[PDB]
């Protein structure tokens, strides 16, 4: 494919490890779409060279630069450095449809059927299920929509510096219109690091297509032992082991 792509984001070498694992798992399950990562100059030169081997396009985004299209918005909203960088995913008009994926996500099965949905399709947030989690969503790249989100980010800002409030406000019809824009939760399982005794966790892998390590603790923060294959994730350790198995096999030798 050339008009559709998976888009991820990393602003440093830490989240770059998650993007490399996410990109690797997308290649493991054989996606016909392209793999794009939005990187910033804070990513080291050697880490960027590793991203070029796993991803088809490494697109540099520096909102701190005066010439960047979101810099004027950043001067008025300095707390949105990462958020405004992510919003650049709507400016990739060389694709007609994209799925954004957080760098702390992991693909367990082919999800190319996500391109059957329309903008904007996303999974419910596990805490407040009336809102959608912005870690995985189907969108349509548009210069116009990009400018409206920059405008909405200026007036609204963000309590935690994230983009969940801005996207939910702009796409305010998600909660009550078209059930087809409700992605199944298995396309964005963001409860693996929050809850331990969820009923769906009685199944190995929880029948998930995509798992999302939402929270303040990320997989690259754990200490791994490849000899034993071990490290609320203590009760369902398959997702931590899967992340580290792919990292040590696919990503670590490239470092």
Ligand X SMILES: O=c1ccn([C@@H]2O[C@H](COP(=O)(O)OP(=O)(O)O)[C@@H](O)[C@H]2O)c(=O)[nH]1
Q: Does 4 carry a binding-site annotation?
A: no
Contact between residue 66 and residue 73 where contact means Cβ atoms under 8 Å apart: no
Q: Label residue 6 exposed, middle or buried (CB < 10 Å: 0-12, 13-18, 19+).
A: buried
Per CB under 6 A, does 232 bind ligand X?
Answer: no
Among 32, 93, 148, 177, binds a copy of itself (CB under 8 A): 177
DSSP 83: H
Stretch that binds ligand X, among 25-33, 54-62, 98-106, 108-116 (CB under 6 A): 98-106
Per CB under 6 A, does 188 bind ligand X?
Answer: no
**184 binds, options ligand X, Mn ion, a copy of itself, none, Cβ within 5 to 8 A by partner type:** a copy of itself
8-39 burial: b if 16+ Cβ within 10 Å, else e: bbbbebebbbbbbbbbbbbeeeebebbbbbbb
**Considering only CA atoms, which of 8, 207, 179 is closest in space to residue 98?**
8
Q: Rank residues 207 and 248 by Cβ distance to a copy of itself and give the closer one.
A: 207
Strand partners, 97: 4
Residue ranges that bind Mn ion, judged by CB under 5 A: 102, 104, 135
**Site map (CB under 6 A) of ligand X, residues 63-82, x = contact:** -------------------x
Among 143, 194, 217, 255, binds a copy of itself (CB under 8 A): 194
The nearest distance, CB 228 to ligand X, in angstroms, is 27
User: Dmax of the chain from CA atoms?
Assistant: 52
**Considering only CA atoms, which of 106, 137, 144, 134 is closest in space to residue 119?**
137
Asked if omega into 110 is within 30° of 0 (cis), the reply is no
Measured at the CA of 122, the angle between CA 217 and CA 210, to 5 degrees, comes to 50
Among 89, 214, 240, 251, binds ligand X (CB under 6 A): 214
Q: Does 215 carry a binding-site annotation?
A: yes
Q: Rank residues 201 and 247 by Cβ distance to a copy of itself and give the closer one.
A: 201
Cα–Cα dist 88/44, whole Å: 20
**Contacts of a copy of itself in 110-139 (CB under 8 A):** 123-131
- Residues in contact with ligand X by CB under 6 A are 8-12, 15, 82, 86, 102-104, 135, 214-215
- Residues in contact with a copy of itself by CB under 8 A are 123-131, 159-160, 165, 175-179, 182, 184-186, 191, 194-195, 198-200, 202
**Residues in binding site for Mn(2+):** 102, 104, 212
């Amino acid at each position: 494919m050339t008009d559709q792509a998976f888009v991820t984001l990393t602003t440093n070498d830490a989240y770059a490890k998650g993007a490399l694992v996410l990109g690797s798992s997308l290649k493991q399950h054989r996606t016909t779409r392209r793999l794009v990562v939005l990187a910033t100059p804070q990513v080291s030169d050697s880490m960027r060279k590793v991203l070029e081997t796993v991803f088809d396009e490494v697109i540099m985004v520096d909102v701190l630069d005066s010439g960047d299209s979101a810099h004027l918005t950043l001067m008025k909203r300095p707390e949105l450095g990462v958020t405004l960088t992510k919003l650049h995913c709507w400016s990739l008009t060389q694709y007609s449809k994209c799925v954004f994926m957080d760098a702390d996500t992991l693909v367990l099965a082919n999800i190319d059927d996500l391109f059957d949905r329309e903008e904007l399709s996303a999974a419910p947030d596990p805490g407040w299920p009336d809102c959608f989690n912005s870690g995985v969503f189907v969108y349509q790249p548009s210069v116009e929509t990009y400018n409206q989100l920059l405008h909405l980010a200026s007036e609204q800002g963000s309590f935690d510096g994230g983009d969940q409030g801005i996207l939910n406000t702009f796409f305010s019809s998600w909660a009550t219109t078209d059930i087809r824009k409700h992605l199944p939760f298995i396309y964005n399982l963001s409860s693996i690091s929050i809850f331990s005794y969820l009923p769906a966790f009685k199944v190995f892998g929880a029948s998930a297509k995509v798992v999302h390590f939402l929270g303040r603790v990320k997989p690259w923060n754990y200490t791994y032992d490849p000899k034993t294959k071990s490290v609320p994730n203590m009760t369902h350790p398959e997702f931590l082991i899967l992340w580290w198995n792919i990292f040590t096999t696919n990503v670590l030798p490239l470092l």
